[PDB]
Design a protein around this ligand. Structure first.
Ligand SMILES: Nc1ncnc2c1ncn2[C@@H]1O[C@H](COP(=O)(O)OP(=O)(O)OP(=O)(O)O)[C@@H](O)[C@H]1O
Ligand SMILES: Nc1ncnc2c1ncn2[C@@H]1O[C@H](COP(=O)(O)OP(=O)(O)OP(=O)(O)O)[C@@H](O)[C@H]1O
Ligand SMILES: Nc1ncnc2c1ncn2[C@@H]1O[C@H](COP(=O)(O)OP(=O)(O)OP(=O)(O)O)[C@@H](O)[C@H]1O
Ligand SMILES: Nc1ncnc2c1ncn2[C@@H]1O[C@H](COP(=O)(O)OP(=O)(O)OP(=O)(O)O)[C@@H](O)[C@H]1O
Ligand SMILES: Nc1ncnc2c1ncn2[C@@H]1O[C@H](COP(=O)(O)OP(=O)(O)OP(=O)(O)O)[C@@H](O)[C@H]1O
Lengths: 362, 362, 362, 362, 362
DNA sequence: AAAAAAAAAAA
DNA sequence: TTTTTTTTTTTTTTTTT
C-alpha cells in the first residue's frame, strides 16, 4: 500500500510547520508502535503525543519510501500557501484575534494539570511590568490599536533611553504578543536587502538598538544604523508598496509591517522624527534592580519578557468590551479563573513589595 | 478520475492570480463541500463564493494530487503570458480604459447594496485633494494624457518640497489610478538590476524619495539616490530599449515605463533636470493638517491616497468628451448617480469646511 | 534483489554522519567480504568493525547501484532532521547530559584495553589545570550552570589578561566539554555575517583574542574587534531571536548561543561591559611555565586543552548529586575506577610538584 | 492526436519571436475557432490574422498539454541559435544594413498613422542641420562609410568649438543614428580601465568634453582628458587587439571601436592631432540662434538632437547606388512619400526662413 | 550488453581522477581498436597503455550511451569519497607512507627502459644538493619526523639568507616530497582570508618570501609579511583549531598545517623567533655557482627542485629500518639497484667535482 | 556548489 | 498514465570600495 500525502499535509496544517527538516523529523518518530512509545507514555511534547496514534500506520509506510523530502516539501508549501491567503484576505483585527487564540491555547496547557507553570510567578511578573511605565496597561492597549489601524506615516513608535532601562524587555514582550521579527540595521547597506526580506508577511517588526553618531561625547560608540534608516524611510511610511527579497526568490510587493524602534540617546534627524507617532522615554529605577536580585525566577523563566505576561496584564486590567466578540467567551472564563486564584490583596501586596525593592513573593 | 489542468487555468484567468502560493491556497479551499461552506453562506470574498460551486468536483481530485505546485505554475504562466500579449498588442489608451473598467467594477461592488463604503467620506476625499494643488483636476488630466502619449525625453514629472507636503499621497493615488510600481534607488548600483526588473510590463514607475547630496545646511542627510538617477539616464529618456532582469526566468527587452520622481529639497544636477517635462512644487499648508486631525476617517480608510478618489474627482469635474468612447455609457451612469446623491451646495459646504480648517462633515 | 535505503539510514543514524561523501566512502568499504577484511582483523576504526558484518549484503547491492548519491543524500537529511528536532524540543540539561554521555563513550574507548592513553598522564593535566585558577572546579561548575540556565543579559563571561596566561587553553577545554565553536570578530564588517553564521544550532560560542583600538602604548596591536562586537550587542543579550545566514542558504531565526570572550588589556565600552557577568583576570605566573618545560608530554598529547581533562576534574572534585540522574550511574562507576588505580597521596604530590615548579611525574 | 512541436517552431521562426512567455500567449490565442475570430475580422495585428487558420488545430491540442513551457522554450532556442549562426558570420556592412532597418520600422510609426509628431517640423529639422555645417549631407555619408570600412589609423574625427556651437547636438544626432555609446576620459588614471571597458562588442564610441591642460586664459576649465587620450594610442589607431575589462567580469580581446572626439578650444598636442582624420569646426551662428529662439519646437520636441533626423536627411538627398541592395527598394518606397508631400520650393522656404532668423512658414 | 558503471569506477580509482571531463576524455579514447592503437605502440602515457586493453569492450558500449556525464559523475564521487575517508581516518605516518610509494611509482617509470631519465644526472643532483647544507640528509630526515609528529609549538622551521642562496629550491623540493602548498602573506590583512584558505587538508604549507618593514637601508623592500605573521600566532602554534575559507564554500574547522617560513635578512621580532623549532642559515657559495654553469642539465631538467632527488638522497644515505614497514621491501630493491649502478668511488668523485666547481660529470 | 524544479525511462 | 528515475541552471558570492 502507498503513502497518503494527504495525511502528511494534514499533520503539517495542525502543527503549523514551515520547515521541511522539522516536519520530516517529527513524522519519522511515528514509525514506532504507540503501544510501547515512551514519549506518549510520558506526555512530554503535545505535537507528538496527540498525533502518533493517528499517524502510526502512514508513518511506517513513509519510512520505506524513497521520495520523503518531496512529500514534506509539498506539505510545507501548503502551510505557506494558507499563510499567504490569510495575509491578503483577513482584516488585521482577525489576525490579532487568531494570535490571542494561539496564546490562550498555550496558556491552557501551561497552567493545566499537565503543565509546569504556577500563576503566582506569572502575576508577580505582571506586577513588575506595571511598575516599569506609568499607566502601562493603557500604553499596551494604545500600542495594539496602533498596530491594528496601520495608519499611513502614523505607524512607528520610538523607545529611547540609557542602558538597562527596559526597552528590550518591553519590546520583546510586545513582539511575542503580536507576533513578528526583530531586524538588525547596524550592518552595512549592501546586505541589508536580505535582512529586510525577513519581514515578508509579518505582523510587526522591531528595530533593535540602532546606533547613531556623535554620541562619543557621552561615551556611546558611533555606527551606521540611523543613517541606514534614513535610506529606508519609504518603508517606514507605509503609504506605498515596497519590494522585499529572499535568496533565490523573486520580489514580494507589499506594505511593510509597523512596529518599534529601540535606541540609546543618539540624535535623530528630523526626517526620521517625522515618522514616529510617540516617543517613550525609559529611565532606570533603583528599586526594580533590587527586586530582580531577590526574585531571580523572573529572569530564569523569562517571565517579564513574555507575551503571556502582557496578555495576563490585559486580562486583569481591561474591560471585556475591549476584546473581539469571538474571544470574549474565553476571556470571561479566564477572568473567572484569575478571580479565584488571586485577590486584590495579594496583588496590591506584590506591588508594594516592588516599590520597596523587596522580593515579589514575600 | 484525473485532474483537469484547464479548470485551474480558468480559475486563475478569471481571478488574475500572479502568485503560485496564492493560487494554491485559494484552490485548496474548494476541496470542502459546497452544501455547508461557511464562506459561501457568509459571502466573505468574491474569489471564493462565485467559484466554489463550479470547482468543488475538480478541487477534490487536486487535493489528492502529487503535482500541485507544477499545476499552479503552468496556470500562473498562462496569466503572465496574457499580460505580455496585451502589453505589446494594445494601445496605451486601451490599457488605461481597461484599468478604469476594473476600478469602476470595484466601485460598483464597493458602493453597492452589499457595499461597506459611505460616499460622503469619499467625496470629502475629493474636496481635500482639490485643496492640495491649484486646478488639481487639470493637473490630474494633464498627467493622464502625458502618460498615454509617452513621447521620448518628455516622460517624467518631478515632485519637490519639504518634509510634509502631500507629494507622496498624490503619487500613491496616481499610481493606483494608472497602475504601476514604486522603486527605491537609494541603494548601491550593484543590486539595482533586480529592483529595476520589477518594472517589467508595468504602465507607470514611481521613484520614491530619492536622496540627494549637499543641501546639508537644510539638515537633509545625504545619499546616493540622485547620483544613481544620473546613471540610468537612458531608462528615463526611453528613446532606446533596455534589458530587464528577474531571477531564473529569462530576461526581457522593452522600452522602460514613464513615471514620477519625488524628492525633498536637494540640489539636482542639470544633466538630470534636463529630462523632466514638468516640476510641481508642494508647500505645507497649516489648515490641511488641522482638518485631518478633526476628520481622521480619511486616513484610517486611506481615502486621500486612493485612486478611486481621483477617479471620482475626474468623473465630477471633467466632461464625458475627455474620456474614451467605450467607457462613456457607464461614466454617464455614474455622473448622474453623483448628482443624485450630492447637491452642489453640499460640496461647496465641504470645501468651505476644509478651507476653514474645521472638520469636513461638520 | 534491490538495495535497502532503510539500512543506509540506520547506519547513518548509528554513526551520526551528516556528510554525504563521508557516508558514501564508509559504506563502500563494506562491499568486500567480511571474512578476509583486514580492517576487521586489525580493528582500527570502530565505525567499520562494528558494522561490516551487518551491512555486507546491502553494500554489495549498493555498489552496483546507479543512484548511490541520491540514497546517501536522504540518509544525511534524516540525520540532520533528528538534529533539528532535538534542538527545538530538548532542554539544555538534556543537551549537556547527551554531550557528557558522548565524552564518556570516548573515554571508555581511550582507557580500555585497546586504547593508548595513560590515566596518570591525563590526571597530571587535572593537577596543572587546578593550579591555573583558584577554586578551579567551582569555576568550571559555575560556568556549566551559567551555560545551562541561559539567563538573558547574564550569560557571557570575559577572560582577560596578558599574552601567555592560559586564556585559550582553558577556553578550548571548556569548548570541547560543552561543544561549540570559536569565532574571529576581528574581520572586516562585511565578512562578519558569515563568521557569525558559524554559530547556528551550537550550544556555546567563544570569541578568540578580540582586539581594540587604543592602548597601543602598551605595545598592543590595534584592531576592529571591539568595535564590531559593540554592533552585535543584541546577539550577546539573547533577549530576541537574531537572523543568521550561511552562504547560499536562507536566514535562520534563533537565539544566539552564550559563551566566552578572550581579550588582551584593551579598554572596553560600557555598552559591552554591561553584557558580561563575570571577569576572570588571568595572571602569568612562572612556576607553571617551568613546570611545562619539564613535563612536556602535556603539550605534545594535547591533554592540557582537552575537555576530557575537565570532565575528569569534575569527576574527581564534584559530589555525585550535581550530575543529572541518568548519568549518575556511569559517574559513580568512574569514581570507583579512579579511586582504584589512582590515589590521593599521589595527587597531592603532583600538585606539590606543580607549585614547586618541577616536573610533575615521579 | 498529439502536439506538433515543429509547427510551434515554424510559427516562432516566421514571427521571429524570442520570448517564451510571449510565444505561449500568442499561440494560446489560436485555440478559439477562426470562423468567429474578432481579432482576425478586425485585422488588428499581422502576427495573428495570418496564422490563426493554419495553427488552430495544433493550438487546440496544445491547450490540453501539461508541458507547454517545454514546447515553447525549444522553439525559442531555435530562434536564438539561428541568430548566433548569423551573427558570428556577419560582415560590417550587413551590420549597418540591419541597424537602419530598425530605424526605418520606427519611422513607419509616423508613416500611415497618427501616432507621431508632425513631419513638417521634422523636415525643418533636416533643413536646420543642413545649415549647421557646409554640405552637411556629404559629411554624413563620408562618416558612415568611414565607420563601415574600419580602416586602421583612419578612424577618428575631431569636433571643436566653444559653448553653444551645436557640437553636442550633432554628436547626439550621429550617436543616435549609429548605436554606439559615450565615454568619459576626464577621470584620474586609476579609474579609466572600467570606463574604457564600456566599449565592448560595440559599433561606435564618442568621447565627450575632454578638458585640456591649462586654458584658464580662455576661461576653459582644466582637466586630464587630453593628456589621458594621448596615452591611448593603441586603442585609437586600431591595428592590434586590446584587452578590455568590465567590472566583475574577465577580460575580452577585440579591436577598439572608431568614432568621435568633442572639445572646447583647448590646445591639442601634435601627437594626438595626427591621429584624427578630419577636424570639423563648429562655430556659433547668430541667425541660427535667433531662429531657434523663434522656433522653440526645434528643441522642445528634441527635433535637432534626434539622430532619426539624419536618416531623414540621407533619405532625400542621396542617390540610390549609395544604399545596399537589400534596402534600395525600401528607400525609394519611402522616398515617394516626400515626393508626394513636399516640393523644392517649400524646402527652400524652410532653409530661407532659418537663414533669415525666423521660424518656418508657408 | 549495457554499460558497466563498475568498470568505469575501477578506472577512476586506479587513475585517481577527480575531474569529470578528464575522465570522460580518457575513457572515450578506449573505443578505438587496441590492435592498431598508436598511443599504446608509442607508450606515450601510462594512464592509457596499461588500461586500454581491459576497458575496450566497455568503452565501445559507453561511446553509444546517452548518460555519459552521469556515469562519470558517480565515478568521480567515488574517488572523492575515498579521499575524505582517508583524510579523516589515516595516521600522518600512513599519509606520508602513501605519498612515498606514489613517488616510487613515478621513479619506476622514469628510470625504466621505457623512461627518459638518466640516473647519472639525477645522482649528480643528489651530490649537488648534499653540498648545499651541512648534514643535508639528517636535516631532511629531521624535517620529515617533525611534520609527521606535528607537536604543538615544535612544528615550524625558519629558512633565512641572502638572495640566490637556495631557499625556495629546498622549500620547493620539500613540498613535492611531503605534499602541500605555498602561501603569500604579504597581502593586506583584509585580503588575507582566501589566501589562508589554500591550506585546507594540506599536509604542509610554505610561507614564501615574507617581507619585513625595517632594514630598507640594506636595500630590502618594505612589506607587511612579518607583521602579518605576528598576528597569526595561533595558526602557527597549532594547539587549537581555526576556521578556513575558500571562495563560495562554507568555513571548515581544523588544526592548521605545519610548515616552513622563508625570508631574506630582515629583522625578526623576538616574539616570532620563539615559534620556530629550528633556524637554517643559507649562504651563497661560489663553487656551487661555478658548478651550475658547467653542469647546466641540473637546472634545465629541474632536477634540484624535485622531491625525487630528495627521495633518492634518503634512499642512498639512510638505514632501511626507519622507513615504514610496508615500504621497506620496495626500498631494499631500490638500494640494490642504486648500488649496482653506482660505486662509492664514482659518487665521491662527483662530490669532489662539486667542491671545486670543475663540473659534476667530468 | 547547492537548491528549485524540470525533464525522461520503463511498465 | 503511472511510478520511478534522471538532469539544468542560476543565484550568490566575489569584487569593489
Ligand atoms: N527600568 C529598569 N530599571 C532598572 N533595571 C532594569 C529596568 N528594566 C530592566 N532592568 C534590568 O536590566 C536588565 C536589562 O534590561 P533591558 O535589556 O530590557 O534594557 P534596555 O534599556 O533595553 O537595554 P539596552 O540599552 O542595553 O538594550 C533586565 O533584565 C533587568 O534585570
Ligand atoms: N500640504 C500639506 N500641508 C500640511 N500637511 C500635509 C500636507 N499634505 C499632507 N499633509 C500631512 O502630511 C502627512 C504625510 O503626507 P505625505 O506622505 O504626502 O508627505 P510627503 O511630503 O510626500 O512626505 P515625505 O517628504 O516624507 O515623503 C499626511 O498624512 C497629512 O497628515
Ligand atoms: N598562567 C600562566 N602562566 C605562565 N605561563 C602560562 C600560563 N598559562 C599558560 N602558560 C603557558 O603559555 C602557553 C600559551 O598559553 P595560552 O595559549 O593559553 O595563552 P593565552 O594568553 O590565553 O593566549 P592567546 O591570547 O594568544 O589566545 C601555554 O602553552 C603554557 O606553556
Ligand atoms: N551653430 C549654432 N549657433 C548657435 N547656437 C547653436 C548652434 N547650434 C546649436 N545651437 C544651440 O546651442 C545649444 C548648445 O549647443 P549644443 O547642444 O550643441 O552644445 P555644445 O555646443 O557642445 O556645448 P557644451 O560644451 O556646453 O555642451 C544647442 O542645443 C542649440 O540650442
Ligand atoms: N647556495 C647557493 N650558492 C650559489 N648559488 C646558488 C645557491 N643555491 C642556489 N643557487 C643558484 O641560485 C638560483 C636561485 O636560487 P633560489 O631559487 O633558491 O633563490 P633564493 O634567493 O634563495 O630564493 P627566494 O627568491 O625564494 O628568496 C638557483 O637556481 C641556482 O642557480
Amino acid at each position: 500500500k502507498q503513502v497518503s500525502w494527504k495525511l502528511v499535509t494534514e499533520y503539517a496544517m495542525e502543527t503549523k510547520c514551515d520547515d521541511v527538516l522539522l516536519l520530516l523529523g517529527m513524522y519519522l518518530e511515528f514509525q514506532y508502535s504507540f503501544e510501547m512509545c515512551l514519549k506518549c507514555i510520558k506526555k512530554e511534547q503535545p505535537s507528538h503525543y496527540k498525533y502518533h496514534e493517528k499517524h502510526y500506520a502512514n508513518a511506517a509506510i513513509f519510512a520505506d519510501s524513497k521520495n520523503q523530502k518531496t512529500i514534506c516539501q509539498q506539505a510545507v508549501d501548503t502551510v505557506l500557501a494558507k499563510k499567504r491567503v490569510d495575509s491578503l484576505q483577513l482584516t488585521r483585527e482577525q489576525m490579532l484575534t487568531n494570535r490571542f487564540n494561539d496564546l490562550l491555547d498555550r496558556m491552557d496547557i501551561m497552567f493545566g494539570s499537565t503543565g509546569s507553570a504556577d500563576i503566582e510567578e506569572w502575576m508577580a511578573g505582571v506586577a513588575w511590568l506595571h511598575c516599569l511605565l506609568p499607566k502601562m496597561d493603557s500604553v499596551v492597549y494604545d500600542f495594539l490599536k496602533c498596530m491594528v489601524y496601520n495608519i499611513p506615516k502614523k505607524r512607528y513608535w520610538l523607545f529611547k533611553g540609557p542602558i538597562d532601562s527596559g526597552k528590550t524587555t518591553l519590546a520583546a514582550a510586545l513582539l511575542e504578543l503580536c507576533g513578528g521579527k526583530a531586524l538588525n540595521v547596524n550592518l552595512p547597506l549592501d546586505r541589508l536587502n536580505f535582512e529586510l526580506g525577513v519581514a515578508i508577511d509579518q505582523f510587526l517588526v522591531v528595530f533593535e538598538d540602532v546606533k547613531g553618531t556623535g554620541g562619543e561625547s557621552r561615551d556611546l560608540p558611533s555606527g551606521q544604523g540611523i543613517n541606514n534608516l534614513d535610506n529606508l524611510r519609504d518603508y517606514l511610511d507605509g503609504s506605498v508598496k515596497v519590494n522585499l527579497e529572499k535568496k533565490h526568490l523573486n520580489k514580494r510587493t507589499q506594505i511593510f509591517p509597523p512596529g518599534i524602534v529601540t535606541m540609546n540617546e543618539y540624535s535623530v534627524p528630523k526626517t526620521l522624527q517625522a515618522r514616529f507617532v510617540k516617543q517613550i522615554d525609559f529611565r532606570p529605577k533603583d528599586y526594580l534592580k533590587h527586586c530582580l536580585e531577590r526574585s531571580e525566577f523572573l529572569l530564569e523563566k523569562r517571565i517579564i519578557q513574555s507575551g503571556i505576561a502582557l496578555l495576563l496584564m490585559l486580562i486583569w486590567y481591561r474591560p471585556v468590551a475591549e476584546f473581539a466578540q469571538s474571544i470574549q467567551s474565553r476571556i470571561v472564563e479566564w477572568k473567572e479563573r484569575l478571580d479565584k486564584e488571586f485577590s486584590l490583596s495579594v496583588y496590591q501586596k506584590m506591588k508594594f513589595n516592588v516599590a520597596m525593592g523587596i522580593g515579589v513573593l514575600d
